[PDB]
């Protein structure tokens, strides 16, 4: 009757295997979300040994056995590539969810009915998540720097947060054309040693990774006409390589970045005339230096010409913490802007590089939705006491659906209390009571002193595409995994 | 500290053994409550075989081992003294109220919390019972019948409930003086063979269990002057025996009932004149026949008189079921009141004699207190959705407790319906929603239909003392229990 891999589990047998798998990797992930947790150390196979707190990776490495348990990576995985933030959230409440869906299924529910609850309480939840929404519109600066600070919390520096959420709002407020499309690609993040957390600056242009070629070429130009060649100023020795260099100084460059190198004796001519030049320079390089400086990007070094060519307000080669790089400031029309990040080690620079990228992301969310929620746990307790009262509206089995799915929304505000060594059942009361009466806004779980607070007036708050995706893609993922009743296993 | 007798437990060690205590005893007698509940077969160390439903006697005969188990007979035992039904009630949801409690001293709250709850929610629950009280008067007759039929429910004739309700009303609106005290002892319940369930009749008088001794007496007397001797017709032969019987004739007596005997030359003398007389008749049927008749109860024979003596339209010796009995009807001033009971055998007889004694008790309760309150399960449901709401009120520890005691109050009307088979999710939704909107009087649990019911309008309702006593007795005896925190045992 079957063959090829076959040991077979319906009903109880089934329950066990899909609950244990999903419970598992929740426990995994429970104590990594927000201010109150904690670090994990992986090791595979290659005996290789790897500290991390962040949920995707964490289930990536760990070669899994449970196939059912494999379909749950899948649901943290599609929350990182998309939005980013909330890996954690989508998933954890995807295992909790399921525990609670066990108590029932042991009431012999018709798995039928329990889904007929958590669907109509997904849906309603949409109508809830949308109103607690405390609308503040798109380019208001106050709030931009409260969505940006929350882009920077639980992090190796949330400290900076006020200087990492400023030159960020200036750098996305400066990129986006026709209010309501929201571009990342544009904001590069360079990371150099020396400073503090607050000496991060926003050069209206492009800061690349580039020496001066020829030691010839003046180490700084004033009002410079930067060229872009993506393609060859290599030909083989004497003549060819002279005709390429005397045609750059024919058109109008002082400044040249070529994605395709330089020889010796051709930088000697470049520096003969007062032309500086930057070798090997990356095509990442190229496009940024194009919108910085103002450039239309060419093919070769042989089309290089002042007209497809830029305008730039200072251009020095600056050695910065024992490495040379090329700056390109005062930029006329930056689409797209680089933010210099001063910094600790490469590790706190990188992070203030990621505490902008996911800041520009998340504000490219308050362009397209200029909603703002709910200071982490906040909107949960609100959804709580609404959707409880929603339940007294359904009737039948779907009663017992929607009640359970509210009371498991208290999962996340709970653990972030517990992790915090707090009395849960006091605060819960504190926050719930203060949310029905203040609003969206006001109604928080602050870690610190331990009591309900204005994540708003702090503000401490996060974008709205974050909360939205994290809950939907999670919620419907764990009702798939709900619903397979029959496991015939095998490799 | 230690030995003889003792092992010790604190912690989860104690906790378990009392709980086990607890749940078990209860598991036993949950099944027996209500429309929908079954028998149980007891056997003692004697060998004796014993089949009963009633939860006092169940727990009384099985030789119980756990001391803590021993605390818990005394909480169904006191409920039977009082009211009667609630045995069952007082002690199951005693056991249930434990199991919940569990979930919390596991918890880890401080048993001081639990209890903090359960006492404000017992208070409150006082305020609630008070209200779901549906209004009406002392000797109203629809509500007399209702409270009568619900003293006749889930017993061997709930049968003739209608006919058993109406002769009891009659019998207790007969007895009371100054409306607001209902006396018991004065409604005698005489069992005999042959009738049906509905042919049960109120002779405003007394019907005893003596025949006419001496064959010479008067097989029927018209307007008779009954005489009440507690004292010996008993003297040593010839003379002393006749001027005691000549003394009865000298007053007025047609009729006579002596506590004590009659020697055979004596009843030959009282039959000589037309005197009837009744042999070995107890103390019992002595201050019965005196409320019937209108007598005042004297010492000896001698004593006998016109006076001290009664008045009674009809006194005939009627074979009934082929047992001789003496009837004493059309009594002029009856304070007290035999109610002849015909059915099927002995059992159906005696049963309508129990189904009137509880019916004269609870009667006696709606005299003194003017309230009526629904079975099966109006007042449960209504406390549920009120005491839920009353939680949101409270704040802290005490939240938790009062939600767990309102949930507790549902399991009786859940089982209730299970017993049936009786998906209880739907109905409970049914009866709850109906109650918040109609009232006290019309939100039922009628087994038969399957549906929410006007207990009132149908008939089906209990008194007030029954549900008041029930409640409080049970709730603070399981709190108690839940206190003990240290067992040292035994020998």
């Amino acid at each position: 009757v079957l063959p090829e891999n076959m040991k077979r589990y319906m009903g109880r047998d089934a329950q066990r295997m899909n609950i244990l798998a999903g419970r598992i990797i929740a426990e995994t992930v429970r104590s990594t979300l927000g201010p109150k947790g904690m670090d994990k150390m992986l090791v595979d196979d290659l005996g290789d040994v790897v500290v991390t707190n962040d949920g995707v990776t964490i289930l990536r490495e760990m070669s899994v056995e449970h196939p059912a348990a494999k379909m749950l990576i899948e649901v943290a995985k599609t929350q990182e590539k998309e939005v980013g933030d909330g890996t954690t959230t989508a998933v954890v409440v995807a295992g909790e969810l399921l525990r609670k869906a066990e108590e029932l299924l042991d009431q012999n529910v018709h798995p039928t009915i329990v889904v007929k609850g958590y669907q109509a309480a997904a849906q309603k939840a949409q109508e809830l998540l949308k109103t607690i929404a405390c609308e503040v519109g798109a380019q208001d600066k106050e709030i931009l720097t409260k969505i940006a600070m929350t882009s920077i919390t639980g992090k190796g520096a949330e400290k900076a947060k006020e200087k990492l959420a400023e030159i960020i709002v200036e750098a996305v407020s400066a990129v986006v054309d026709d209010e309501g499309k929201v571009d990342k690609d544009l904001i590069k993040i360079e990371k150099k040693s020396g400073a503090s957390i607050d000496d991060t600056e926003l050069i209206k242009g492009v800061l690349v990774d580039k020496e001066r070629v020829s030691a010839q070429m003046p180490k700084k130009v004033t009002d410079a006409k930067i060229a872009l060649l993506n393609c060859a100023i290599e030909e083989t020795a004497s003549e060819m390589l002279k005709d390429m260099v005397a045609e750059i100084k024919a058109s109008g460059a002082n400044v040249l970045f070529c994605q395709k190198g330089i020889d010796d004796l051709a930088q000697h001519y470049l520096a003969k005339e007062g032309i500086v030049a930057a070798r090997r320079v990356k095509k990442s390089d190229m496009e940024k230096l194009a919108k910085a400086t103002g450039a239309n990007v060419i093919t070769n070094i042989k089309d290089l010409s002042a007209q497809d060519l830029g305008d730039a307000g200072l251009v020095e080669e600056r050695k910065i913490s024992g490495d040379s790089m090329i700056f390109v400031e005062e930029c006329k029309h930056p689409k797209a802007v680089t933010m210099l990040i001063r910094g600790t080690t490469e590790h706190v620079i990188e992070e203030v590089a990621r505490a902008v990228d996911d800041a520009v992301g998340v504000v490219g969310c308050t362009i397209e939705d200029g909603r703002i929620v709910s200071g982490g746990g906040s909107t949960e307790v609100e959804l709580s006491m609404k959707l409880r009262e929603y339940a007294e509206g359904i009737s039948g089995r779907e009663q017992l659906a929607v009640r359970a799915f509210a009371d498991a929304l208290e999962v996340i505000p709970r653990t972030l209390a517990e992790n915090a060594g707090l009395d849960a059942i006091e605060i819960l009361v504190k926050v719930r009571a203060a949310h029905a009466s203040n609003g969206n806004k006001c109604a928080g779980l602050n870690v610190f002193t331990g009591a309900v607070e204005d994540m708003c007036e702090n503000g401490v708050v996060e974008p709205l595409r974050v909360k939205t995706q994290a809950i939907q893609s999670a919620a419907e993922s764990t009702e798939m995994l709900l619903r397979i009743d029959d496991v015939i296993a095998a490799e």
Side-chain angles (χ1 to χ4, degrees), chain A residues 57 141 148 193 205 215 236 341 380 421 444 458:
Chain A
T57 283
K141 190 208 20 241
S193 139
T236 268
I341 355 129
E380 339 302 348
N458 247 113

Side-chain angles (χ1 to χ4, degrees), chain A residues 80-98:
Chain A
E80 180 275 324
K81 256 120 177 120
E82 344 175 43
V83 57
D85 294 310
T87 60
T88 337
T89 334
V91 178
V92 148
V93 317
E96 232 46 272
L97 235 71
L98 281 180

Side-chain angles (χ1 to χ4, degrees), chain A residues 204-360:
Chain A
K204 85 165 121 149
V206 172
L207 213 172
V208 290
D209 215 337
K210 310 292 191 238
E211 327 131 16
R212 291 220 183 271
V213 270
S214 173
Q216 246 22 69
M217 280 170 154
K219 246 12 126 189
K220 178 176 162 75
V221 221
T222 23
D223 278 64
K225 311 62 140 351
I226 296 231
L228 304 195
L229 293 154
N230 137 295
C231 178
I233 194 157
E234 74 185 295
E235 296 295 333
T236 268
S238 237
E239 223 180 340
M240 297 154 250
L241 230 187
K242 199 181 180 302
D243 288 9
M244 314 143 106
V245 202
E247 183 310 308
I248 297 141
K249 152 142 203 260
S251 292
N254 103 17
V255 178
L256 187 121
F257 300 89
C258 24
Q259 160 176 342
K260 293 283 153 282
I262 357 159
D263 194 61
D264 350 63
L265 133 93
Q267 309 144 15
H268 210 281
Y269 278 131
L270 289 293
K272 266 245 144 10
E273 255 147 350
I275 294 229
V276 280
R279 88 176 192 153
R280 266 71 145 95
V281 174
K282 350 241 214 65
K283 156 153 53 30
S284 239
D285 40 287
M286 218 85 220
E287 294 159 24
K288 312 182 219 335
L289 292 141
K291 302 162 166 266
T293 85
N296 17 37
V297 0
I298 70 174
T299 48
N300 144 351
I301 156 24
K302 79 205 223 56
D303 283 32
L304 214 256
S305 282
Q307 31 261 358
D308 307 282
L309 301 172
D311 212 36
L314 245 42
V315 196
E316 187 169 37
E317 186 225 300
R318 282 192 190 146
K319 264 159 194 132
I320 160 192
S321 128
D323 293 89
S324 312
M325 306 165 99
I326 303 174
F327 281 65
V328 210
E329 43 172 272
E330 291 182 45
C331 300
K332 173 278 272 167
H333 176 272
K335 40 25 116 106
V337 49
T338 295
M339 251 178 37
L340 220 179
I341 355 129
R342 343 253 245 147
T344 87
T345 221
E346 275 97 7
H347 238 117
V348 181
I349 300 220
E350 328 180 281
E351 156 67 25
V352 182
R354 259 158 276 183
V356 47
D357 252 0
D358 299 312
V360 172

Side-chain angles (χ1 to χ4, degrees), chain A residues 127-134 371-374 379 382-383 386 435 439-441 464 467:
Chain A
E127 327 258 333
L128 326 155
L129 282 142
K130 332 145 33 125
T131 50
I132 64 47
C134 61
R371 226 133 352 85
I372 86 198
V373 282
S374 351
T379 292
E382 178 83 339
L383 276 173
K386 288 177 311 176
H435 244 203
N440 20 64
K441 88 213 239 28
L464 235 225
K467 160 89 352 65

Side-chain angles (χ1 to χ4, degrees), chain A residues 97-106 108-121 396-402 404-405 475 478-479 482-483:
Chain A
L97 235 71
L98 281 180
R99 153 282 287 239
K100 278 294 352 225
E102 186 137 26
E103 306 191 18
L104 280 5
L105 294 169
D106 11 53
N108 231 130
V109 338
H110 266 274
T112 64
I113 279 305
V114 54
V115 297
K116 233 91 217 255
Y118 304 54
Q119 60 200 191
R397 347 152 128 319
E398 295 66 51
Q399 188 173 50
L400 309 306
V402 312
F405 186 134
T478 57
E479 71 181 78
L482 214 345
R483 56 157 335 215

Side-chain angles (χ1 to χ4, degrees), chain A residues 16 21 28 57 99 105-106 126 145 167 215 233 257 260 275 278 281 285 332 366 369-370 385 393 407 411 447-448 490:
Chain A
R16 163 117 45 47
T28 268
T57 283
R99 153 282 287 239
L105 294 169
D106 11 53
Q126 256 348 256
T145 78
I167 40 130
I233 194 157
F257 300 89
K260 293 283 153 282
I275 294 229
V281 174
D285 40 287
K332 173 278 272 167
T366 72
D369 291 325
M385 60 180 75
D407 242 355
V411 267
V447 336
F448 276 125

